[PDB]
Design an enzyme around this catalytic site. Structure first.
Site, PDB file in Angstrom:
ATOM      1  N   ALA A 234      -6.137  18.713  23.677  1.00 36.53           N
ATOM      2  CA  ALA A 234      -4.883  18.616  22.994  1.00 36.53           C
ATOM      3  C   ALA A 234      -5.043  18.354  21.553  1.00 36.53           C
ATOM      4  O   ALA A 234      -4.559  19.068  20.763  1.00 36.53           O
ATOM      5  CB  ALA A 234      -4.068  17.529  23.612  1.00 36.53           C
TER       6      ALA A 234
ATOM      7  N   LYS B  30     -50.072  10.939  19.830  1.00 39.31           N
ATOM      8  CA  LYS B  30     -49.845  12.152  19.297  1.00 39.31           C
ATOM      9  C   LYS B  30     -49.219  13.007  20.300  1.00 39.31           C
ATOM     10  O   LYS B  30     -49.774  13.211  21.287  1.00 39.31           O
ATOM     11  CB  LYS B  30     -51.134  12.621  18.961  1.00 39.31           C
ATOM     12  CG  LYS B  30     -51.002  13.651  18.013  1.00 39.31           C
ATOM     13  CD  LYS B  30     -52.347  14.057  17.917  1.00 39.31           C
ATOM     14  CE  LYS B  30     -52.160  15.478  17.831  1.00 39.31           C
ATOM     15  NZ  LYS B  30     -52.127  15.417  16.423  1.00 39.31           N
TER      16      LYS B  30
ATOM     17  N   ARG C 180     -41.890  23.297  10.319  1.00 42.58           N
ATOM     18  CA  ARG C 180     -43.027  23.078   9.434  1.00 42.58           C
ATOM     19  C   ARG C 180     -43.147  24.168   8.373  1.00 42.58           C
ATOM     20  O   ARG C 180     -43.142  23.907   7.247  1.00 42.58           O
ATOM     21  CB  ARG C 180     -44.268  23.006  10.356  1.00 42.58           C
ATOM     22  CG  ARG C 180     -45.570  22.246  10.096  1.00 42.58           C
ATOM     23  CD  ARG C 180     -46.346  21.953  11.478  1.00 42.58           C
ATOM     24  NE  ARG C 180     -46.080  22.866  12.688  1.00 42.58           N
ATOM     25  CZ  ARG C 180     -46.280  22.615  13.960  1.00 42.58           C
ATOM     26  NH1 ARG C 180     -46.694  21.511  14.333  1.00 42.58           N
ATOM     27  NH2 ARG C 180     -46.035  23.457  14.816  1.00 42.58           N
TER      28      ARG C 180
HETATM   29  N1  LIG Z   1     -47.400  10.570  15.859  1.00 35.14           N
HETATM   30  C1  LIG Z   1     -47.536  11.569  15.035  1.00 35.14           C
HETATM   31  N2  LIG Z   1     -47.618  11.396  13.757  1.00 35.14           N
HETATM   32  C2  LIG Z   1     -47.768  12.371  12.925  1.00 35.14           C
HETATM   33  N3  LIG Z   1     -47.821  13.583  13.277  1.00 35.14           N
HETATM   34  C3  LIG Z   1     -47.783  13.930  14.508  1.00 35.14           C
HETATM   35  C4  LIG Z   1     -47.640  12.929  15.490  1.00 35.14           C
HETATM   36  N4  LIG Z   1     -47.580  13.529  16.624  1.00 35.14           N
HETATM   37  C5  LIG Z   1     -47.678  14.794  16.390  1.00 35.14           C
HETATM   38  N5  LIG Z   1     -47.800  15.025  15.149  1.00 35.14           N
HETATM   39  C6  LIG Z   1     -47.922  16.368  14.714  1.00 35.14           C
HETATM   40  O1  LIG Z   1     -49.206  16.828  14.990  1.00 35.14           O
HETATM   41  C7  LIG Z   1     -49.514  17.694  13.937  1.00 35.14           C
HETATM   42  C8  LIG Z   1     -50.933  18.130  13.799  1.00 35.14           C
HETATM   43  O2  LIG Z   1     -51.799  17.309  14.458  1.00 35.14           O
HETATM   44  P1  LIG Z   1     -53.053  17.952  15.073  1.00 35.14           P
HETATM   45  O3  LIG Z   1     -52.887  17.848  16.532  1.00 35.14           O
HETATM   46  O4  LIG Z   1     -54.121  17.325  14.374  1.00 35.14           O
HETATM   47  O5  LIG Z   1     -53.100  19.332  14.686  1.00 35.14           O
HETATM   48  C9  LIG Z   1     -49.108  16.836  12.835  1.00 35.14           C
HETATM   49  O6  LIG Z   1     -49.135  17.458  11.625  1.00 35.14           O
HETATM   50  C10 LIG Z   1     -47.751  16.478  13.254  1.00 35.14           C
HETATM   51  O7  LIG Z   1     -46.899  17.518  12.999  1.00 35.14           O
END
Ligand SMILES: Nc1ncnc2c1ncn2[C@@H]1O[C@H](COP(=O)(O)O)[C@@H](O)[C@H]1O
Ligand SMILES: NC(=O)c1ccc[n+]([C@@H]2O[C@H](COP(=O)(O)O)[C@@H](O)[C@H]2O)c1
Length: 321
Positions: free
Chosen positions: A35, A116, A137
């Protein structure tokens, strides 16, 4: 030149109508009733008969029925360069990275240790608490506009929550990773195969595909998640450390992880690495490593970055198995 109040009213009303259109049509989740929406659109239609120049083909009224929402992946600049990370695969390398740091900055550096995530990197910009841009990116300086797709992610709020402790900044650029939970990844694959589509080989690919959709309603119905890890350009926010930054992010409603720890020296770092080597499988999303970052932002500034990566952080990477 149109009178100012007329222009004020129109932007506000059009902004509000469009947001609601997006919520209903793309996300399949309105936050106001039917509405109320109807009333809103009427007013904006009136105002446009009263003022015809306001009606343009980009208006939510003339020419937007349930449409106009599409992602075109066009280039958009990041406010701050979005680099990659250096990697460490063995204990020697990590120690080597720490030696280089100790020598430069001398026991004063503490290390934030995060998981990570193996997913897609996403960069969000919030201007006065409102999300304006989301991007990939790309080359580091420029990525792609996937703004509407990010607006469908449940984890990503449209607006930031205000508070006493942490005032909403004027500009905030936040980096983080988009991902699927393993279960969801499986589930999506079943669904896709059920319609005659090919399934995805891994969750990283699946999330990237789900994010990169021209029609963002496709993305809305997939369960992507995001965990924030980083800051790009910010105004009105000057945290002394990265761990303190996450407190603010969390207070404002951004999603952060619960597995971050603050180690005090390399020995502490080593324990976490060993620990997640054993426990990473217990997490519901893919973890390929641990990111080690010097926590104080002044130390980060002193160490700086190269063209490709920062020198204040290193990612330890596990062997896949
Ligand atoms: N906790 C985190 N801090 C920063 N970057 C991360 C993280 N987890 C993933 N990434 C990403 O992982 C990308 C590359 O990491 P790598 O696995 O070394 O190639 C980084 O540039 C981030 O985009
Ligand atoms: N609650 C909302 O946010 C919202 C937004 C946009 C449209 N709608 C509904 O969409 C319908 C539009 O009609 P058709 O697409 O079927 O022409 C209207 O009933 C309208 O109220 C609801």
């Amino acid at each position: 030149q149109t009178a100012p109040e007329v222009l004020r009213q129109w932007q506000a009303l059009a902004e509000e109508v469009r947001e609601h259109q997006f919520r209903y049509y793309v996300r399949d989740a309105p936050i106001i009733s039917d509405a109320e929406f109807d009333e809103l659109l009427r007013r904006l239609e009136a105002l446009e008969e009263q003022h015809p120049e306001l009606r343009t083909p980009d208006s939510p009224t003339q020419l937007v029925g349930g449409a106009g929402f599409a992602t075109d992946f066009e280039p958009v600049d990041h406010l701050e360069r979005m680099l990659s990370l250096d990697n460490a695969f063995t204990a020697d390398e990590l120690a080597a990275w720490a030696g280089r740091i100790h020598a430069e900055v001398g026991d004063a550096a503490h290390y934030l240790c995060e998981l990570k995530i193996d997913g897609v990197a996403l960069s969000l910009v919030y201007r006065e608490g409102r999300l304006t841009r989301a991007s990939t990116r790309g080359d580091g300086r420029t990525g792609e506009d996937v703004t509407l797709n990010a607006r469908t992610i449940a984890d990503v709020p449209e607006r930031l929550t205000p508070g006493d402790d942490y005032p909403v900044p004027e500009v905030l650029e936040v980096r983080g990773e988009v991902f699927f939970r393993l279960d969801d990844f499986q589930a999506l694959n079943a669904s896709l195969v059920e319609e005659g589509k090919a399934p995805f080989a891994n969750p990283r690919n699946s999330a990237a595909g789900s994010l990169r959709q021209k029609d963002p309603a496709v993305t809305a119905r997939r369960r992507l998640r995001m965990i924030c890890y980083g800051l790009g350009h910010v105004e009105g926010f000057r945290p002394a450390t990265l761990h303190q930054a996450y407190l603010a992010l969390r207070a404002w409603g951004l999603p952060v992880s619960e597995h971050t720890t603050l180690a005090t020296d390399l020995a502490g770092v080593r324990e976490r690495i060993d620990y997640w080597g054993e426990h990473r499988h217990e997490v519901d999303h893919e973890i390929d490593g641990v990111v080690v970052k010097v926590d104080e932002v002044a130390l980060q500034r002193r160490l700086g970055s190269t063209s490709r990566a920062p020198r204040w952080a290193i990612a330890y990477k596990y062997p896949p198995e």
